[PDB]
Amino acid sequence: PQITLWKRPLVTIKIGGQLKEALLDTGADDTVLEEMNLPGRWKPKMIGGIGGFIKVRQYDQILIEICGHKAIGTVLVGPTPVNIIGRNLLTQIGCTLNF
Amino acid sequence: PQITLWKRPLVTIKIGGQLKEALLDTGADDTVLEEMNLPGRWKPKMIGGIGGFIKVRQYDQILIEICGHKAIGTVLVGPTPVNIIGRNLLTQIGCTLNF
Numbered sequence: 001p002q003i004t005l006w007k008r009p010l011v012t013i014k015i016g017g018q019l020k021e022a023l024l025d026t027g028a029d030d031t032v033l034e035e036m037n038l039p040g041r042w043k044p045k046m047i048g049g050i051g052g053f054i055k056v057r058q059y060d061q062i063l064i065e066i067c068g069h070k071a072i073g074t075v076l077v078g079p080t081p082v083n084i085i086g087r088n089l090l091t092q093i094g095c096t097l098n099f
Numbered sequence: 100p101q102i103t104l105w106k107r108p109l110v111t112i113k114i115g116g117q118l119k120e121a122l123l124d125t126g127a128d129d130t131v132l133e134e135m136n137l138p139g140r141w142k143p144k145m146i147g148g149i150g151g152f153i154k155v156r157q158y159d160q161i162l163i164e165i166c167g168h169k170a171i172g173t174v175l176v177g178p179t180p181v182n183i184i185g186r187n188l189l190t191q192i193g194c195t196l197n198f
């Protein structure tokens with residue numbers, strides 16, 4: 001589909017057997033989701049935003065379905081105010097900016 | 100144009116007569132540029148993102164050209180790590196997400 005930017009581009013995602021709302025974020029290198037208890041191994045990581053850095057848990061080869069489009073990649077989990085779908089997954093669903 | 104997301108969606112912008120590189124950021128409500136001198140009155144403001152808040156100078160009704168498209172809107176200037184073009188200006192140039 002096509003998504004205008006009058007409002008935040010929020011969509012439904014499916015991850016780890018749960019439905020959530022997440023922000024399609026072309027300004028994000030990585031995908032960062034709100035605290036959730038995903039199974040399997042993880043590694044500590046630090047990611048920076050405009051205000052500084054936060055600690056997150058890095059999970060690899062995680063499946064996320066974004067508006068019916070599936071993507072598999074690295075997902076970071078930590079105290080973020082919003083679920084962020086970043087370019088590592090947006091590329092996999094064929095997402096482009098157009099003007 | 101149509102822009103894919105394998106690399107950061109950086110474009111050249113012209114503001115205050117000066118050229119800069121900026122990130123087309125669908126995950127940003129607002130446009131925030133690195134420290135620079137701009138003509139016109141400004142008001143102090145604060146914006147929050149991942150990591151916390153930064154103090155910015157808010158310029159209203161600023162002319163800015165983004166990849167050959169003109170916009171006139173609010174520009175925040177402060178210690179942001181990267182120049183980000185947010186939805187307030189992305190809407191003006193007709194930018195949409197598509198997949």
Ligand SMILES: COC(=O)NC1(C(=O)N[C@@H](Cc2ccccc2)C[C@H](O)[C@H](Cc2ccccc2)NC(=O)O[C@H]2CO[C@H]3OCC[C@H]32)CCCC1
Nearest residue numbers: 025027028029030032048049050126127128129148149180
């Ligand atoms: C490689 O570094 C990243 O990519 N790290 C992330 C990031 O924070 N990237 C930011 C750019 C950027 C690039 C390098 C270093 C610092 C910053 C841009 C993101 O879209 C961010 C997402 C977001 C949305 C709502 C609330 C909070 C965070 N939006 C944002 O901060 O927007 C601002 C301006 O407008 C306002 O509305 C939203 C908030 C305000 C993306 C993944 C994790 C962090």
